[PDB]
Design a protein around this ligand. Structure first.
Ligand code: HEC
Ligand code: HEC
Ligand code: HEC
Ligand code: HEC
Ligand code: HEC
Ligand code: HEC
Ligand code: HEC
Ligand code: HEC
Ligand code: HEC
Ligand code: HEC
Ligand code: HEC
Ligand code: HEC
Ligand code: HEC
Ligand code: HEC
Ligand code: NO2
Ligand code: NO2
Ligand code: CA
Ligand code: CA
Lengths: 520, 520, 75, 74
């Protein structure tokens, strides 16, 4: 059984924690629930850690007093089809392989599934670790509870004796790097300096051997990612988000200074010795838009190249951990600001951005966001009980599973079927424009080899490559973004028509240039 | 409350209406239900209209005495997925964009949804009005009752101050013209001369500014499209249909002179001054095949070009409003008869027809049509009630929703699952042949640029373009036709194999010609 | 098929019905829907019925214009 | 509230002209229209439970009244 420790004694040296702990709703929650500091207290001074105390990062540390939130979080949504590759005719991006050729996502890019699996899925996807990690067997793919208990309880490493990223199967890539893990887990929250910068007190950083880092990480989506364990108050911990919102002064709602001020973030820094080491962002309100924006954003979490001179931007560069914190129409400028692109298309040679699930930046300015609706309202609503204590569902999933709570309480004028029909109208229309955007991008892409071989000039090819960047951005945003337009249907529409416009411009340019070469 | 008017006084001048009204089942229905003629009666003579009386075109005019028919009509089938683009891998025509390139349907071609929405969907589709019209917001897409009450109750116009067709968003077209509206509404039934010919008494015609016309139109599928409001007897009002069946003497069943005589149409013309102005076609029987053929046919409703010399056929030409009234194997001849094609393929340059939902002409000769089965039997059957007055469902939808009434009363040997399985066998087989037809058409289409660039002669390209017309017709009929072969499975099969045969012939022709050029 | 009768002819002797019928929401609903009064009209006086007109009491007399109400009633 | 509100309410249609149901019957068959539009605080099962609480209690007193009437009669 746990025995409480003298918190007051801890506070003689931990005044920041004292100020958080004594004021919030965890004021009565003893440190022993999440720390083992016996040897630490015997050896520390206010200026010397002494023995490092243990800090529990497991979600069970919270589940004893918050079982409903834990259980609704770990629940597996079996209808969220697993390991479902998006590059197929029946999924999000039928022409993804042609369009993304040159990028690691060509090796595999599945639809998301339940949050319980985020860390294990990161480890086993074919693009991440060369196929080094697998579930112990194909049955373990069901075990959300096991994955939450710890990735290494359900995974195997093909070669525990080596730590290098390499291919273990031919059609894999080794795209994983330490920055990725920040959106899968925060088990390393005390071992990783802000942004993943080199730091004397950081075991891990952007430049770590990601296989070694991986082995040290266990739990998905730690409960403390959104809730300070000391104050119990709302926060974020993701460095790239705090960087965009606070360091870069972009605010929580870059398009709304008022809402940014009402629903803002306060950066709190923790030191190691005299030196700033890590930071959190306390939220003014329990704002799930910003909590979910820790991961559901477009980001760099990878090396890339400079737009200016094409040179490598490696993991050591701060730009390898970056939240652009920009809507689709501001993204190109945001990428130009940091002088960065992700990859060169394998066929066209164009410098291209790689977009990832920009749900947060898409949601801005949408009708629901402007009306003060937030991610949680549709994806983790309060539970409705005929008789019971209300709590907030932590099963973060499509509102189709809980339409009464997620939609119909607000939309009293609709039945469930009507609300689903409204969702489907948007997704159907958006998906048709995605598919047409791909058709046109693919038509352009296929002209590049013809053009090159016909002797079309580099100047014309470069003009087309510039158009490719735009056509790509304005399409990929929407295959990357998970709502298929629902989060901002007018923006999706405008962007995808822009994509098609750009591709058509490039097609015309190339066909005319090819035709002129032939005519010579 | 309505006050009845002296119908006998109206009849002193309206002898045609008298003959219809006094004999049918609306003999007791007073004019005041659908007309406000007070000032008209005070000012008219038998030879001068005087003040124009109001004629109600709203469906509510019928709904007071026929609520069941109205309510079953306005019902939204939410399972008829809305705004679902057909040019996608999971819909009717995965290669539609490549095959239809050059035509306005490339901008958007969704699957049909419930009849309540036909007018609003016509107005908001991306190919029609440059994106000028939108639903007031994305919630209104559910509101079938609102759309029936009036399009402009649920839509907005991006620029009420201008009336020209232009693009408001880049990836739109302005294909709509006044002829379209004849298959969406008949609110203009008193304002449109037969065929949309210029007429002194017509506010609207084929050559009208379609945006201005659009604003004057409100209701979908007026109840009087199939039912004369005066006699209550069965009719059609669509000019192009009466033209094909009566003016051109093709008959209601061009392949069956006997059935054409038993189930015929009598053209009734109404004058303005001394001049024929508009017409209806009274049906000998309540023949839904012909009622539904007012819209579910292949047609011209658009400008095109002449096959003979390639010259423009504009909206002013009668050919812009035309029911070919021909099965797929008679269509090429029917198009040659009026010297007409729709568009030139953007890649091949071939003159091509554009086919639209030829359900009526497909149904002819099929086993059900030969057995006297009609559209209504499968798509708007009598309701079966344990205790009640039977009426005819007006929810015109797939028989999958009412298999007992639509199929199984006739097919006593089958369970519902068996009948669905028989439907799916046909649609699966037909769809696989559609997909193969597209594969071969696409293969041919892709050879055109290669051939042109290899220096293949215009004569060879023109031979291939002639084959393209055939390959296209024999394929597109079936993506345009909504039953995926069910309405005439053997015809679909024969046509689609013909398409593939033609495409293969063209592929061989082009590959050989390209190979010969290279060998030189 | 029903042929309408001249209600004004009825109203000349049927003031109470006239006052009810002309004002309410059945003002346009002809008497023939529920009455066959041909011989009555030929034989009545202002105070004597003459031949008795037929009056339909069946619910179907209302079901043709109010099918939904009738069908929900008979279920 | 009147008899029709619970026993022949207006029909609820996603798309349609409203009319008054003339099927005069227990509200258990149409609780959404007959009870729950007014009693927004209840689910159907809660409303049914409230009906049954009354009916059960009342029927129990009817049975007891009969018991005592029968005892007197005998
Ligand atoms: C004698 C002063 C003192 C005492 C008392 C004290 N601490 Fe610490 N603690 C420190 C110092 C110094 C550090 C290192 C801070 C730094 O890195 O500069 C530290 C670090 C920590 C850490 C972070 C270790 C890491 O992984 O980086 C935790 C957790 C912690 N203390 C918990 C506690 C708990 C719980 C108690 C009471 C049971 C306690 N401490 C009492 C001085 C103290
Ligand atoms: C020993 C029991 C216990 C432990 C362990 C525990 N909590 Fe709590 N938590 C509480 C209590 C008690 C409250 C206050 C309940 C109330 O006042 O409504 C609370 C409140 C909260 C709140 C609501 C705070 C607010 O301001 O509304 C959150 C969020 C929360 N805890 C998160 C967590 C997290 C995350 C963990 C794991 C790091 C955790 N708790 C571990 C007991 C616990
Ligand atoms: C900014 C936070 C963030 C970063 C950093 C991040 N991810 Fe993700 N990842 C997400 C989110 C959110 C999803 C779920 C939404 C989706 O898949 O579109 C996801 C989904 C996934 C999935 C499951 C779906 C799929 O694509 O197969 C895998 C695997 C994955 N990430 C691997 C990685 C890899 C490998 C890296 C580093 C190269 C990485 N992630 C970095 C946020 C992040
Ligand atoms: C992605 C951010 C996020 C994560 C991670 C998270 N929560 Fe929450 N949590 C929320 C939100 C949003 C609320 C509702 C806040 C509000 O509306 O007041 C909430 C509310 C709570 C509450 C307050 C009581 C309630 O249910 O409303 C508790 C306790 C809680 N969470 C516990 C946990 C536990 C335990 C975990 C780990 C299993 C967890 N949370 C993980 C976002 C998160
Ligand atoms: C907290 C209240 C609330 C929630 C929950 C809610 N809505 Fe809304 N929704 C609104 C409001 C307010 C509007 C704007 C209404 C207006 O301006 O007329 C709106 C607008 C919409 C629109 C127009 C969308 C656009 O971006 O233009 C759609 C579609 C819609 N809602 C569907 C849904 C769906 C489906 C759900 C559940 C996933 C949902 N709503 C949940 C309040 C809500
Ligand atoms: C004094 C003769 C006369 C009387 C009586 C008469 N009408 Fe007319 N009505 C006309 C004439 C003339 C026209 C125009 C025909 C033409 O265009 O040549 C016309 C046209 C119409 C139209 C078509 C208007 C249009 O939009 O084109 C309607 C409807 C109509 N009448 C209804 C009625 C009704 C109902 C009554 C009885 C309440 C009535 N009329 C009585 C002479 C008459
Ligand atoms: C004031 C009531 C009323 C109005 C308004 C009304 N109808 Fe009728 N309708 C009738 C009656 C009464 C019948 C005959 C019922 C019977 O005899 O079976 C009828 C019969 C019909 C029939 C059956 C005719 C046949 O020969 O079988 C059709 C079709 C019809 N109406 C269509 C309509 C249309 C379309 C409208 C709107 C333009 C309309 N009605 C408006 C009362 C009305
Ligand atoms: C006035 C022209 C017109 C008439 C007459 C007509 N239709 Fe339609 N039909 C349409 C249009 C337009 C649509 C597509 C509506 C939309 O997408 O908004 C459609 C759609 C349909 C659908 C698809 C409905 C769904 O659930 O998706 C069916 C089935 C159908 N029609 C059958 C029929 C039948 C059977 C008849 C004869 C009883 C008929 N139609 C008469 C124009 C017409
Ligand atoms: C001969 C009658 C007729 C003509 C004229 C007509 N339509 Fe249609 N339309 C239909 C029918 C029937 C459907 C439903 C069956 C289908 O979509 O295949 C339909 C469906 C539609 C739809 C919904 C499905 C889609 O394609 O997105 C739209 C939008 C539409 N039409 C627009 C137009 C436009 C624009 C015009 C004129 C350029 C036009 N229609 C002319 C009969 C017609
Ligand atoms: C596309 C043609 C079409 C349209 C438009 C149409 N109907 Fe019908 N209607 C039919 C057919 C077919 C029948 C059945 C005729 C038969 O089999 O005897 C029918 C029958 C009827 C009847 C006779 C009673 C019955 O139900 O069989 C009435 C009344 C009627 N319709 C009213 C309306 C109303 C009111 C509207 C407008 C909401 C409407 N109709 C629109 C085709 C149509
Ligand atoms: C009014 C009666 C009737 C209706 C309703 C009916 N059928 Fe038929 N069906 C027939 C008859 C008669 C045949 C020819 C039987 C024979 O010749 O042996 C037939 C033939 C068929 C065939 C062979 C088709 C072909 O074109 O070669 C299929 C499949 C079929 N029916 C399925 C259905 C389905 C599914 C439905 C409901 C959508 C349906 N039928 C509704 C009477 C009907
Ligand atoms: C020839 C068609 C017809 C006949 C037959 C008919 N009604 Fe009506 N009834 C109407 C019309 C038209 C209205 C007015 C609809 C409106 O304005 O909303 C009406 C309205 C009504 C109303 C609504 C009155 C109000 O003040 O709101 C009732 C109740 C009604 N009728 C009952 C009956 C009864 C009972 C019968 C049989 C004795 C009957 N009707 C027969 C056509 C008819
Ligand atoms: C506030 C709603 C309400 C009102 C108003 C109401 N009732 Fe009831 N009625 C009920 C309920 C609840 C029952 C029990 C039904 C059951 O248990 O299935 C009932 C039972 C009945 C029953 C027996 C039903 C059956 O199927 O056994 C009759 C008859 C009845 N009521 C008639 C009336 C009359 C007449 C009126 C107006 C004087 C009236 N009710 C008003 C709610 C209502
Ligand atoms: C026991 C009394 C009663 C009987 C008998 C009755 N009704 Fe009604 N009726 C009502 C009531 C109550 C309403 C709703 C009045 C209100 O709330 O405005 C109504 C409304 C109506 C309306 C107006 C439209 C609507 O639906 O609200 C019509 C039409 C009507 N009834 C027709 C009929 C028909 C036809 C019959 C015979 C099948 C019938 N009624 C028998 C009580 C009755
Ligand atoms: O691939 N994780 O965005
Ligand atoms: O596009 N209407 O056939
Ligand atoms: Ca990115
Ligand atoms: Ca056509």
């Amino acid at each position: 059984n746990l025995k409480p420790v003298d918190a007051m004694q801890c506070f003689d040296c931990h005044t920041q924690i004292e100020d958080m702990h004594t004021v919030g709703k965890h004021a009565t929650v003893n440190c022993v629930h999440c720390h083992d500091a016996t040897e630490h207290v015997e050896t520390a001074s206010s200026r010397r850690m002494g023995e490092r105390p243990v800090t529990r990062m497991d979600l069970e540390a919270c589940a004893t007093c918050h079982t409903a939130q834990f259980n609704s979080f770990v629940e597996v949504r079996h209808e969220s089809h697993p390991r479902l590759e998006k590059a197929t005719p029946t999924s999000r991006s039928p022409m993804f392989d042609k369009l993304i050729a040159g990028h690691g996502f060509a090796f595999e890019h599945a639809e998301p599934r339940s949050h319980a699996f985020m860390l294990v899925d990161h480890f086993v996807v074919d693009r991440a670790y060369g196929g080094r990690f697998q579930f112990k067997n194909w049955q373990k793919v069901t075990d959300g509870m096991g994955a939450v208990r710890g990735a290494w309880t359900v995974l195997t490493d093909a070669d525990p004796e080596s730590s290098d990223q390499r291919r273990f199967l031919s059609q894999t890539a080794t795209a994983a790097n330490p920055v990725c893990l920040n959106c899968k887990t925060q088990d390393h929250i005390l071992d990783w300096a802000y942004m993943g910068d080199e730091h004397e007190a950081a075991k891990w950083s952007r430049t770590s051997e990601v296989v070694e880092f991986a082995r040290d990480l266990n739990h998905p989506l730690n409960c403390f990612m959104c809730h300070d364990p000391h104050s119990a108050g709302p926060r974020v911990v993701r460095d790239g988000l705090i960087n965009a919102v606070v360091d870069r002064g972009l605010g929580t709602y870059p398009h709304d200074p008022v809402k940014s001020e009402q629903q803002g973030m306060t950066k709190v820094t923790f030191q190691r010795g005299r030196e700033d080491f890590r930071a959190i962002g306390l939220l003014d309100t329990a704002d799930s838009n910003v909590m979910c924006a820790q991961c559901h954003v477009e980001y760099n979490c990878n090396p890339g190249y400079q737009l200016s001179d094409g040179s490598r931007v490696g993991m050591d560069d701060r730009r390898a951990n970056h939240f652009f914190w920009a809507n689709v129409f501001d993204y190109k400028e945001a990428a130009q600001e940091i002088d960065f692109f992700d990859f060169r298309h394998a066929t066209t040679g164009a410098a291209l951005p790689k977009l990832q699930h920009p749900e947060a930046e898409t949601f801005w300015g949408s009708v629901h966001e402007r009306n003060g609706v937030a991610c949680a309202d549709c994806h983790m609503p309060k539970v409705q009980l005929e008789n019971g204590k209300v709590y907030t569902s932590h099963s973060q999933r499509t509102p189709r599973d809980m339409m009464g709570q997620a939609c119909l309480n607000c939309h009293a004028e609709w039945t469930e079927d009507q609300a689903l029909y409204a969702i489907d109208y948007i997704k159907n229309y958006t998906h048709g424009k995605i598919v047409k955007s791909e058709y046109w991008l693919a038509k352009m892409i296929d002209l590049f080899p013809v053009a090159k071989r016909a002797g079309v000039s580099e100047d014309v090819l470069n003009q087309a490559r510039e158009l490719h960047y735009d056509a790509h951005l304005y399409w990929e945003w929407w295959t990357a973004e998970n709502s298929v337009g629902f989060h901002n249907p007018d923006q999706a529409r405008e962007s995808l028509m822009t994509s098609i416009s750009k591709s058509k411009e490039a097609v015309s340019l190339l066909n005319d240039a090819i035709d002129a070469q032939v005519a010579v």
